[PDB]
């Protein structure tokens, strides 16, 4: 959409994964928090369908290694279920 | 023309505190919609922490008015506590005096608030919910000493009416909400159920017979009712670590209205998520109720909202815009703020939101 | 204290405005080159063992790439201290 | 330099500051009045001519205060009238400054009666309710001026548009319409609603930019009006006068002081009389007045746009930019009209100056006969169309290039102004990447992507001023008769002295663009005063390079090294006398300081082109065969 | 002087068709500078209504409707799509389905509905003395059977 | 700070028979009018419009 709606830095609404707790299911606790940080969402296949098209991007915050199905190259190729590969940001202070 | 002069002030506190001072002045040259004029009134509300272990607080209220050459006084004084997060307990007493007649009373009450749903999606997709439907249930046991002839007359007439007619339970709502109040009940969004009488007794007391009545009623809302949708906000038992006050007074006449308000109490500012805080969402019942008297004369508007923040706090996303920043203060006047003031003084419920951070 | 700040590596451009506000007794912000500084090879970083959570780095609203985040004490992640309300738009023509 | 920023003041302090400034203006006008005195009514041979009074002398002579004569009664009466008017100005200015005190400190209380006053009612709440009564207030100023002329200066109102009595008649006609327009706006305020919320930055910027075009209008109106036969008694009566200025070539003195000096003149170090009709004084004053309003008018325009950007950026940071109904915002809140609008203006600017620059070099080539060419091969035939030849006297090729250089110069500066208007927060390239603008004054972002210098809107303002020099300077050449049509003219090289006759110019211009500098400075070098201005102007200008080049880090190097020398030199030559540690301007201050030295230095010298004579003949310059 | 200005700019157009046809084109623009009475701002919305003749023999038509809104930083979407027919002149039948999504939550549904409209009177004098009746009292009865798949917690 | 509206449409039922050979625009619906009247009384306003 227009540059003046939301944040001007990003081309679409950005999300981050913040929680990775294991509750009898491994990775039920995917907590999609938006850039503005007022909600705590989940995979929620509606979120997945709006991800796959053009509108959602998610990142992993180097601060669920296999339970989120890392595949095999460049130390990062995180995929959620089968379709889209959530890119990740790095924050290495060392 | 009918200019409307009003003056507002909010003063906040820093840290995690939520206390605030509120000040207000107002003037209009319009005739109030009162079929008896003139009319004057003063209100004192005080509250102090009875003890924090129980959560019990003590609250007092005094009303004096002169309504067309007639002095009216109402005193109430009570102790309230949250027994659960959806039940509340109260023990209090008071009196009411009109002209020469006067009588005391002592009540013993409980209130239960219930929401119609608890869906957590409504809690993770909407950051600032506004409308929330529910219902309140009141259980009251009140004792009034019968010492006057008129008190005994009222008591006997009420016993006869309750015994004889089969439609007392729903016709009592006609006598209950006298005059225009009843009409507001429909529009303001409320629904009062039929009362249910659990027994009227009379027992000997210190000076004589005392009439004891206990009764239950309920009222539901579509979300506009604050006492239901915001059950948690209106009784901040946590931050009452020192006495708080509310102290107002209006003085009406055949040619305009005078207003004067002081106050200091917690709950003025609330957390808004992401480190930002906000002024509490404006209550809707006062707006829509005052909108039933604010459409009678078109008027000119001038006002000045002056908000004072603590050290290091900044206002960001103030809609409409403010006009000045005297390094700690923010002032709103004219323009879109004036339009919003004229909008809300007629029953409009548009949102004027202020977010501040540090 | 709480609410750490965590410059993002991949988004930083090295403008250095974040580094200015940090008090001189606290040199929590530094530089990393690893290459030629014309195609983006001098991205900065934050030292967590010296930072004292001033918020001068976040509350100043200076980062142009959204590289400062200020993660909240519990789990929440910010990117800028306030975001506009993301409406959506069209075109009009008064006939 | 942000002590008086708009977001820190309330509404009354503006009124107080305006009243104080009006009082200061009255003081300085009185100062000018007594600077224009010749004889001192008691008799005390007064002052000599200076450029400040010579600019306003025609207006006084029109009003019957000053005069063009040298007698007994005339100068005595003129001095008395000037003293009276100066005293009146001093009194009113003192009163106005006291009223400024009264409005600055929130103290509207009567001194005689213990009364108070509310700024709200005494009225208006917003600025649109204030537009109305102001028109009523101005109707009183027009009414008073007609009264002042009629009662004091004579000049009964008569509709004769050849003498000044028409001015008195017009001030009464205007007071009718401004009053009538005042009531209607008091009952029906107009509506560009966004100017009331942040009303002391938004509304201010619109007014400042609007005043800029008004000043340019009066700049052009004065140039045409002052050359009419009606204005003859007040402007080219200057020619047949003799002027004594400060800094004139004085009566020189030898080393024998004996000392055979000069002409027969009793004062030693006397100021020589300078004829004002060989010296083109009638046009010199006209040029001075006109150019002042043109350059000030342009500068107000740039400032008005720049402050609109400061507001425009602010409403995009909190969030209201998405939130305007005013059509003045929705017509550019799309990012596809902006590229089209900026595209269509940067292409027209391309098509126009390339056309004139092709003509100017081709004419310049044809004179010098470079590449075996004649002057007959030049554009000596490109006159304006016959429907446009009324606005010019003696239409020719020199007018054709001027009418297009102004367009080429204006649109060249408009590019910066548009980029202030639209790309204050985001640009297509900055949104092409992930990036922000957040401060309207940040100097750069670093060497990333090859360099990010001068993208903020304050920098865009600097380039508009720098690009505006070419347009502004083109006016100085044109109004001084400089033949901007070719870049060499009157040069005795090949054919420059031929333009005359192959084009039937019927006038004679001073020189070409380059040869403008060699001529004209014949008189500048003759005056010691003008000579010092020449040296100072050039000294100030080139210092801009010290702060405009990419060297701020280099200057931060030496300041550290310097600090240690004045540190190691107070060590073993003199004893401990040193703690000073050299400051270097930041990049944002460097550009602010650089633009003033560049802009200030160049225009202190433009004054020399105007204030040195006219020197445009009327001899067709017969062929150099 | 006088009170607030608040101009309201609006632009309307009707375009008709000739003969016995009843079709028409409608166009509308509007603008006000007044704060909406919404306790959550800002608020945006688009609506699409389309209808096509499923088949004329049965009288069945197919009608779709899509709603998107952004209400104070919250995306809401409602899709409905159905088939409607007049079984009598006072009974109507409908079979349709749709979904509603708020933020991340979303769910579909399929409904099966009938509506009956009844007037309180049918006096023909009201039909021969009044040429353009306006007020007409009555009552509607809705019978709905809706199925929603339960898949979310 | 104000409200924006934009509407297109094309459908039958715009004009109805009125008897005696004349036709008419359909009687304006009343529910939208009375419902919008509950939000249209909050600010006095100036009016300008075309109907074409
Ligand atoms: C007004 C909307 C609802 C209502 C909502 C509530 C709410 C909400 C509560 C009660 C509670 C009570 N209600 Mg009830 N109640 C209503 C109508 C009634 C009626 C009646 C004849 O109509 C009666 C007899 C009662 C009776 C009672 C008692 C059972 C009980 C305690 C009263 C109290 O402490 O007195 C004291 C009287 C006052 C202080 C008068 C001042 C009231 C106004 C509204 C206070 C404004 C607060 C002001 C904005 C800020 C004050 C801050 C100062 C720092 C203190 N309610 C209406 C229908 N009722 C309370 C309870 O739970 O008890 C267990 C409670 O929390
Ligand atoms: C919660 C309301 C307050 C109350 C507030 C007022 C006010 C205010 C006024 C009176 C006034 C009077 N009161 Mg009282 N009054 C109360 C309790 C009582 C009781 C009782 C047995 O409890 C009695 C006999 C009376 C008697 C009297 C009337 C005889 C007298 C003038 C008529 C009037 O309008 O009455 C009003 C009657 C009542 C408000 C309720 C009376 C209760 C009945 C008799 C017993 C309960 C019956 C039923 C189960 C409760 C129904 C709920 C109420 C309708 C809300 N009051 C309760 C404590 N009373 C008037 C006065 O003081 O000077 C003229 C007046 O203006
Ligand atoms: C043609 C007259 C110009 C004008 C010429 C000046 C000049 C010249 C000055 C000001 C100055 C100021 N003007 Mg002004 N000003 C005008 C119209 C405005 C408007 C408006 C239309 O809303 C506003 C808000 C202001 C506001 C201001 C304040 C920034 C300041 C006065 C305080 C002071 O110290 O003295 N001006 C018109 C457009 N104004 C003074 C100032 O502070 O400058 C920094 C100053 O020197
Ligand atoms: C050209 C005239 C100047 C001006 C010059 C003065 C001077 C000088 C004085 C006042 C003083 C006053 N002016 Mg005034 N005043 C001006 C414009 C205004 C405006 C406005 C534009 O809204 C207002 C509200 C006022 C209001 C006031 C009161 C605060 C005060 C005494 C009341 C009275 O004289 O009348 N002035 C204009 C701009 N005004 C007087 C005062 O307060 O004395 C204590 C004072 O000395
Ligand atoms: C602030 C919002 C009101 C407004 C009401 C006023 C009032 C009231 C006044 C001005 C004043 C001025 N306005 Mg304004 N002004 C607005 C819209 C405009 C617009 C436009 C939409 O294009 C323009 C070009 C102007 C331009 C101007 C100048 C013509 C004029 C004096 C210049 C100065 O120094 O002061 N205004 C809107 C309508 N404007 C002053 C003036 O001279 O009016 C004749 C004045 O008193
Ligand atoms: C609004 C006043 C009455 C109402 C009046 C009607 C009417 C009248 C009808 C129904 C019908 C239906 N109603 Mg009902 N109905 C109401 C409240 C409800 C509620 C509820 C929870 O409140 C529900 C679940 C229903 C359910 C239903 C279904 C049983 C059925 C088909 C809906 C449909 O096709 O969807 C599709 C949904 C829409 C298209 C949304 C758009 C709705 C608006 C009003 C259409 C405006 C038309 C526009 C002005 C012009 C459109 C022209 C374009 C060219 C198409 N109604 C309210 C109380 N209801 C229909 C039926 O008979 O089914 C047998 C029918 O004709
Ligand atoms: C963008 C639009 C601008 C212009 C077009 C413009 C033209 C111009 N400028 Mg400029 N200028 C700014 C912009 C423009 N300024 C800005 C933004 C600034 C910063 C504020 C600025 C600054 C300064 C300073 C400091 C000085 C000048 C000069 C100066 C003048 C000399 C150039 C000249 O002779 O061209 C040569 C002109 C010819 C016709 C060439 C003749 C040769 C042969 C026969 C043949 C050459 C072959 C061929 C013809 C070459 C051209 C090819 C072309 C046709 C495809 C000249 C008129 C200099 C002087 O005038 O010094 C006396 C000078 O020193 N400015
Ligand atoms: C006349 C003009 C200039 C100077 C006078 C000068 C002085 C100076 N410059 Mg410079 N400069 C340029 C003009 C002048 N730069 C230009 C046009 C460029 C762009 C190319 C430029 C660029 C760089 C870079 C990149 C660096 C420097 C420096 C550096 C320092 C070196 C210390 C030194 O040599 O001691 C010797 C310094 C002196 C002997 C200065 C004494 C003078 C006496 C008082 C003459 C009076 C000056 C003037 C007439 C009075 C001012 C009145 C006015 C305000 C109305 C030293 C103060 C360096 C430092 O800052 O530190 C080392 C550095 O890195 N520059
Ligand atoms: C933007 C697009 C605007 C297009 C307008 C074209 C500009 C026309 C300029 C030529 C007009 C002209 O020369 O007037 C024609 C008149 C007189 O016209 C001729 O002028 C000659 C001057 O040498 C002689 O005086 C002749 O007697 C006379 O015939 O010239 C003036 O006196 C013009 C006054 C100065 C105009 C300044 C314009 C301000 C622009 C500055 C902005 C730069 C940034
Ligand atoms: S929060 Fe304070 S200590 Fe931490 S990096 Fe920012 S400025 Fe430095
Ligand atoms: S301000 Fe942002 S882009 Fe610049 S160095 Fe700091 S983190 Fe990086
Ligand atoms: S040389 Fe100066 S302007 Fe250029 S990138 Fe470096 S700091 Fe920025
Ligand atoms: Ca000259």
TrEMBL record, chain C:
Q: Which part of the chain is the 4Fe-4S ferredoxin-type domain?
A: 3-32, 42-74
Annotated [4Fe-4S] cluster 1 binding lies at: 12, 15, 18, 44, 63
Residue positions annotated to bind [4Fe-4S] cluster 2 are 22, 51, 54, 57
Highest taxon of the lineage: Bacteria
- Spell out the protein name for this chain: Photosystem P840 reaction center iron-sulfur protein
Q: Which organism is it from?
A: Chlorobaculum tepidum (strain ATCC 49652 / DSM 12025 / NBRC 103806 / TLS) (Chlorobium tepidum)
Question: What gene, per UniProt, encodes this protein?
Answer: pscB
**Segment of the intact protein contained:** 129 to 223 of 231
TrEMBL record, chain D:
Residues binding bacteriochlorophyll a 14, per UniProt: 18, 134
Annotated binding of bacteriochlorophyll a 27, by residue: 102-103, 110, 122
Sites where the protein binds chlorophyll a 1: 357, 470
Q: Where does Ca(2+) 2 bind?
A: 480, 520, 609, 612-613
Detail which positions bind bacteriochlorophyll a 43: 385, 400, 404
For the ligand (bacteriochlorophyll a 22), the binding residues are 59, 167
Binding-site residues, bacteriochlorophyll a 21: 51, 529
The entry marks the following residues as binding bacteriochlorophyll a 30, namely 115
List residues binding bacteriochlorophyll a 15: 18
Which parts of the sequence bind bacteriochlorophyll a 26? 102
Q: Which residues bind bacteriochlorophyll a 4?
A: 2, 307, 310
For the ligand (bacteriochlorophyll a 13), the binding residues are 18, 134
The protein's name in its UniProt record: Photosystem P840 reaction center, large subunit
Native organism is Chlorobaculum tepidum (strain ATCC 49652 / DSM 12025 / NBRC 103806 / TLS) (Chlorobium tepidum)
The top of its lineage is:
Bacteria, Pseudomonadati, Chlorobiota, Chlorobiia, Chlorobiales
